[PDB]
Symmetry: D3
Amino acid sequence: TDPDPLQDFCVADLDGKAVSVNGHTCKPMSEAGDDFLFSSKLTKAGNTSTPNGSAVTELDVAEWPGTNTLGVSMNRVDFAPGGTNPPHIHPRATEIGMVMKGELLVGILGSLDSGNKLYSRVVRAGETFVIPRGLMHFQFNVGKTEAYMVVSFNSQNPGIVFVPLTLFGSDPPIPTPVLTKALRVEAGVVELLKSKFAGGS
Amino acid sequence: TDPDPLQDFCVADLDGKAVSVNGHTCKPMSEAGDDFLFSSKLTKAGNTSTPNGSAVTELDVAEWPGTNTLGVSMNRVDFAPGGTNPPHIHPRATEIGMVMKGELLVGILGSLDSGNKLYSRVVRAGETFVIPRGLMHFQFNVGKTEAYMVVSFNSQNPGIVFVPLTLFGSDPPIPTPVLTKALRVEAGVVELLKSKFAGGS
Amino acid sequence: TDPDPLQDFCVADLDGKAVSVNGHTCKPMSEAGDDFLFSSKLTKAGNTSTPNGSAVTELDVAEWPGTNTLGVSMNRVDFAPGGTNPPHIHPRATEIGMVMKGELLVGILGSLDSGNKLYSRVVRAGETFVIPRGLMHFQFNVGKTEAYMVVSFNSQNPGIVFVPLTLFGSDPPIPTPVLTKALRVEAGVVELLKSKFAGGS
Amino acid sequence: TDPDPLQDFCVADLDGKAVSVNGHTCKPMSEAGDDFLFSSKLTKAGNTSTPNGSAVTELDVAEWPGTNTLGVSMNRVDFAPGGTNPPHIHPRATEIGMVMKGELLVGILGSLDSGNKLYSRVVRAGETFVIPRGLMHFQFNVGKTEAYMVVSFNSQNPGIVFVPLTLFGSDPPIPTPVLTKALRVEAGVVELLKSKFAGGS
Amino acid sequence: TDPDPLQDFCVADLDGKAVSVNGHTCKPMSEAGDDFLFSSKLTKAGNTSTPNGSAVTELDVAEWPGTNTLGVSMNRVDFAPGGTNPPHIHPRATEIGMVMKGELLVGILGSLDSGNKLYSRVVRAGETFVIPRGLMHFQFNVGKTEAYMVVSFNSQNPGIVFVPLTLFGSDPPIPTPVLTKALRVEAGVVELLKSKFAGGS
Amino acid sequence: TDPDPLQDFCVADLDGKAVSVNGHTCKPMSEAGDDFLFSSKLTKAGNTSTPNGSAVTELDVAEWPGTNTLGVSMNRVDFAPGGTNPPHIHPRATEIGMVMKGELLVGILGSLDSGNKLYSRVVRAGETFVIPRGLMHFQFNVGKTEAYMVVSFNSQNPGIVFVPLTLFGSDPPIPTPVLTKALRVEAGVVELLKSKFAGGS
Ligand SMILES: [Mn+2]
Ligand SMILES: [Mn+2]
Ligand SMILES: [Mn+2]
Ligand SMILES: [Mn+2]
Ligand SMILES: [Mn+2]
Ligand SMILES: [Mn+2]
């Protein structure tokens, strides 16, 4: 897990020309003021008019510098009806989440030695779920209304590996012959899938 | 921070006669079923008719066995008007919180080398705060309505050191002469304070 | 990373009825003998006549009990011409590898905040590569001969999330409507992909 | 616990204008000389003519730069007859101590799930005690002579949260109405307590 | 460093037939009583009539079960005039020490990338030293009187690798031809050295 | 073990005038290019015409900057017939190794509480061994041909404490009277041993 802190506070210095280290260097405490332990960035719903039909509003260290060294972060996710937060992985954290409104099918997948088991449940307001570090998982809005959840992590920067976008729309894309061997389908099918992720999101 | 996991899942075996280790031993996976990554325990408001005027509903490993080894937990806190979650400390975790309804004065205190600075702000629906590991902090309901928040931790068992209850109502209590020297007041004042915490909460 | 050791040696007790804990309980040292720090299991090539055209021979704690508590493990991977070790993730470790024979295209993918960049290179005998914890990566045999590599991890049990098999052949499978929304293609395409992973490997 | 070291030595650069990071940046090894692994700062007794009747002489990274990255520090504490080191907490370390002279009542308090139990014993020359990370604890000189102890920590910067000074004399102070609700006493009692800690120590 | 604790207390169960895990299983709290956080084992001087002319009195988890999970331990070392605590290594901890009486030459050796530098100083009563994790170090009594020190570690079980005893008196001994090649001297010299450590201490 | 990473990549900035921190500061990602996750430095055999009769080719962070923050490194070791990699220790890592060609006697030594037990085995092509963190170990070429192995570590900078060179050829050397007491032999024997390591390797 994230390295433990070595003092009370260490607000991230996010200037483009700051020295680079594991994590972030910190502002002098003299320059921090009173408000660094607080945020209002998750107060508003994100724009769900995206190809996925969901929107992620992040509150990692890049958006909340006061989290630097403290071992935590939070995101909000909003969903249109029938929208998905697609199969994804956090390389550097466990996630713990609560549904705030609506009805979400939440799925969590075991690794190979767990027989790739899929656990899935419809989760409603006030109900919670846990995603062990590094495992593939997804959410799907099964209600007729807009849904939203707020999720927390045991890292200041968990990372997000979106599985469809990474497989089919990386920069540059994975070669077609690699994908035909891996996916057990013809080139035409692979090229169709790539055409859907060419725009970069 | 909590030790990292060494497999996908390890649901806590909470039987009274189970072998005792750092954390908890685990149920055989054969005995776990489909639902261990989920809970509904935070769906309902706690009973705020307490001396503090607040109620803590816990979702640590004792209440959510599926969190075992995963490095996370969550609590809900509900507040009557004018109620407080009194000055307290988590010995083993950072906290990250969001206010769900109402208006809460949230205060966080630096240690001695931070000049014991008090940072405090009124936090409203959808707004967030962070409490660095081991620092004293409190919340106070400044609104006219019932308030509530949901908070997450980077530990399966953060611990709670309630400062007033521990100072004045430990089992057995701290000797009066220790408290008169520490608090710089006469025995009568110390005995008055003890009389308020004699009931154990 | 894996918890540090608290003594010199702690050979895993792998009996089916042993108590379950994070990792594994240990054999009494009296029962260990002289050979637990050694193995010959990677001396022989695996059987590459599989749908992927590669074979993974594991030397994690389940196969090498002497690694328990020590923070390391190793695997061997053998490749038929044109074979792939498909896009996969290790939830709990960084990997460091060396190619022993043949020519392998090795690809490593950044996360979202790294713009999902793909780094790829043909790696030959004696040449090395590194895969940061939790990132998607693959290998593809571009030579005319059988290839092989040996890779090490900073975990006794890194875990393997095979991306194609998990997306299309989990137990039970991810619902088709979830995959049509996530993959941006019609049901027929999703069902074709599922038909290729129905056998469980 | 503190992050592990990534090289043999890394003496803290304590200049006021040095770049700020988790912990401290290090002096070039060229500038370190022979003496950084040694100190004489705990050779002399501190001045016990304080309101508490004790004095803490610190040997954390700010006073012993050679401890940087190494995961340890030490303090000395001297006591006048009837003096106290008042109820306090270390947010980032376990403490292990030895009494060198005199007779000290040493008390350690469990958290809420430990029923807030108080363990206390008179500890004499050569006898030892342990304080688990983040728990409230105190010492009180019950002898007729000056007492002293030397204590070590598993952090280069454990932090000190002095409970009375933080509750009643933070900068600025906790509002009186918060303290009347938390302490279950009238405003006059709270104001009396504040008047004793107004001077800042 | 040692894994962090997951609860307040976890006293080691040292029975010979207890289940074996990384570290130690714990006694039920019901069986612990009031005294587990305290010891008197370092109150008395060890017997310095040994071949080394020093004696180590240990207070690791085997001797102080209350240290289990807490990340700390302590030893006392007593020295006859001209006695040595010979070149040794702690595989799993940093050490921080204080001299209590007498005059000790204390030496600390850098690794290969530190040019194998030797730092050494005569350390007297109340003066302190630090030994970074895993580095070779020694002490030698240069005074005319008995000397002693008390040292603390950031592990419950640091381990001790005594260099002369391990090189020349392991069980069974390192083969003579291995030592002649490593030490660049003839068999007769190696056999002389072995004859001095044949007794097992 | 090494601190976990807080982002995908952080290539070490090895310039002599770069700011110094635990580990290394990082190059801006803009300056990294495509090749930092790869190396060819272990492709060639080292020069075994040394006093030890072996050669270590290192691929730690100083030689492979892309390993910075990732928790891993690798070395190659080549052996002349009858050559040794002498008794040594890694202060900051476990090692996991594979023999690539030839026949090597590999020995691993327990600490004092393990009765200083020596485990040793002849290890041949494709066979593996593990060295727990901080324990003394060695290899000796018992074949008639040149041998080689490749070894991996759970640290970017494990450190190497060569026991003979450190005991007899440190900078400056350990005083002769310290070594006569520790080794239980006369000054002449100690001076003979020092004369063999005076050249610095
Ligand atoms: Mn997620
Ligand atoms: Mn709290
Ligand atoms: Mn891999
Ligand atoms: Mn203390
Ligand atoms: Mn030592
Ligand atoms: Mn080695």
